[PDB]
Amino acid sequence: KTIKLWVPTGSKKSYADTIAKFEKDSGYTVKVVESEDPKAQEKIKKDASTAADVFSLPHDQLGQLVESGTIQEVPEKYNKEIAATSTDQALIGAQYKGKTYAFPFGIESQVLFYNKSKLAAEDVTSYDTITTKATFGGTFKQANSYATGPLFMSVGNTLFGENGEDVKGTNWGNEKGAAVLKWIADQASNKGFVSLDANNVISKFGDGSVASFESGPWDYEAAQKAIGKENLGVAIYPKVTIGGETVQQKAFLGVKLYAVNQAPAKGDTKRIAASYKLASYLTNAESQENQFKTRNIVPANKEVQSSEAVQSNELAKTVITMGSSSDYTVVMPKLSQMGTFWTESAAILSDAFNGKIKESDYLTKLQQFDKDIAA
């Protein structure tokens, strides 16, 4: 009566109390092993004997694990609990073709970081205002698709249709997509836009040549240190004016999941039930509260999201606003054709900024993109 759990690196101690509570309530023992979330899929394929009963993963890999038969639909009991307690965006993270396969525990989104000695709060709600009054820095020469890929969805185009599950639904090859490429190209002559490399985002923020930039919670500490805690502002993504339309700038949402792999239980339904119970425990309000407090995990649970501790933390509050609605975030699609998206979107965004494609080529390149990705 032992089940194996894979938890994110560093996290084991954070979860000790949660696990003890589960152990005391279920009478199962839990073997807890740290293991990198992004590698869970590879690890399972390589050695299914050693595979954990319960493991953390990023939702962007959930579609693959479903399609290989590794993760099965959760029991209806848990489906109801997850839908009730999670944000709608988090649930979309946990679902694939209409079924729930995992338990959200966390969310992540990029935000706008700015220097309060260079920009007032009032002036960071609009990209046009930011670059009129100060500077915005981005890595446009070597485009980051995670960062600026969502511009295409910001203007009302989709990545694999509205639900992110139609392999033929990506529709950038139109005037709105072309207008995204135009805006990219225009940033080269926008006097408030500063062309960055990955390795100088933070240092140019520190030296004051970049007043603002977009990144995730992983850069929060470095931003703080670059200009001083008291000078660091955090805000939601601004509006941006593309093709003469002012629209909300979107980012991707990442949803952090626990899932159950039934295979190591070999038909033992008592143990499978225990595995779902563990996942439920790991991702309930109490655990998410503890995970925010100990490891600054931004909760997927609506109730913890609105807690004073979380709402008083400007980074967490901002990530939550971004994850609160599809007005701000696109939940990263799960289809394997995302592979093409990463490669081709980066190249086209780069080429538009660098002038390796011209305006008269924007539409044909985007139409070709739409064809390529639909394979």
Q: Where are the domains of the chain?
A: 2-101+253-323, 109-250+333-374
Q: Do the strands 251-260 and 54-58 form a parallel or antiparallel pair, or are they unpaired?
A: antiparallel
Both tokens of 204, joined, read: 């140019």
End-to-end Cα distance, the chain: 46
**341-357 per-residue burial string, b: 16 or more CB within 10 A, e: under 16:** beebbbbbbbbbbbeeb
Strand partners, 31: 4
Q: Which 3 state secondary structure label does DSSP give 134?
A: coil
Distance in angstroms (rounded) separating the CA atoms of residues 283 and 310: 16
Are 40 and 61 contacting, i.e. CB atoms less than 8 angstroms apart?
yes
Sign, Cα dihedral of 122, 126, 130, 133: negative
Pick the closest to residue 215 from 110, 124, 296, 136 (CA basis).
110
Are 77 and 241 contacting, i.e. CB atoms less than 8 angstroms apart?
no
Pick the closest to residue 93 from 241, 253, 236 (CA basis).
253
Both tokens of 74, joined, read: 């959760």
Assess whether the region 2-101+253-323 and the region 109-250+333-374 belong to the same CATH fold.
yes
Query: To 10 degrees, what angle do helices 362-374 and 338-354 make?
Result: 170
List of residues 6+ apart from 331 with CB closer than 8 A = 59, 89, 92, 93, 164, 252, 253, 255
Could you tell me the strand order of the sheet in which 232-235 lies? Answer: 193-195, 136-138, 212-215, 111-115, 232-235
Both tokens of 181, joined, read: 């490429």
Both tokens of 353, joined, read: 């900024």
Distance in angstroms (rounded) separating the CA atoms of residues 241 and 273: 51
Place of tokens 């139109």: 174
Distance in angstroms (rounded) separating the CA atoms of residues 17 and 284: 13
CA neighbours within 13 Å on the CB side: how many for 144?
A: 16
Distance in angstroms (rounded) separating the CA atoms of residues 352 and 186: 9
Amino acid at 45: K
**272-303 per-residue burial string, b: 16 or more CB within 10 A, e: under 16:** bbbbbbbbbbbbbeebbbbbbeeeebbbbbbe
CB count in 10 Å sphere of residue 162: 11
CB count in 10 Å sphere of residue 164: 21
Distance in angstroms (rounded) separating the CA atoms of residues 52 and 260: 8
Distance in angstroms (rounded) separating the CA atoms of residues 316 and 132: 28
| Helix, strand counts (H, E) of the chain | 18, 15
CATH of 109-250+333-374, one of 3.30.390.50, 3.40.50.300, 3.40.1120.10, 3.40.190.10: 3.40.190.10
CA distance readout (Å), 201 to 54, 198, 221: 37, 6, 13
CATH class of 2-101+253-323: alpha beta
Pick the closest to residue 155 from 175, 128, 125 (CA basis).
175
Pick the closest to residue 257 from 69, 373, 91, 50 (CA basis).
91
H helix intervals, 120-233: 127-133, 145-148, 151-154, 175-186, 201-206, 220-227
Q: What is the 3-state secondary structure (H, E, C) of 112-127?
A: EEEECCCCCHHHHCEH
Amino acid at 330: V
Are 1 and 29 contacting, i.e. CB atoms less than 8 angstroms apart?
yes
CA 198 from centre of chain: 19
List of residues 6+ apart from 218 with CB closer than 8 A = none
Query: Nearest 5°: phi and psi at 320?
Result: -65, -45
Distance in angstroms (rounded) separating the CA atoms of residues 128 and 288: 38
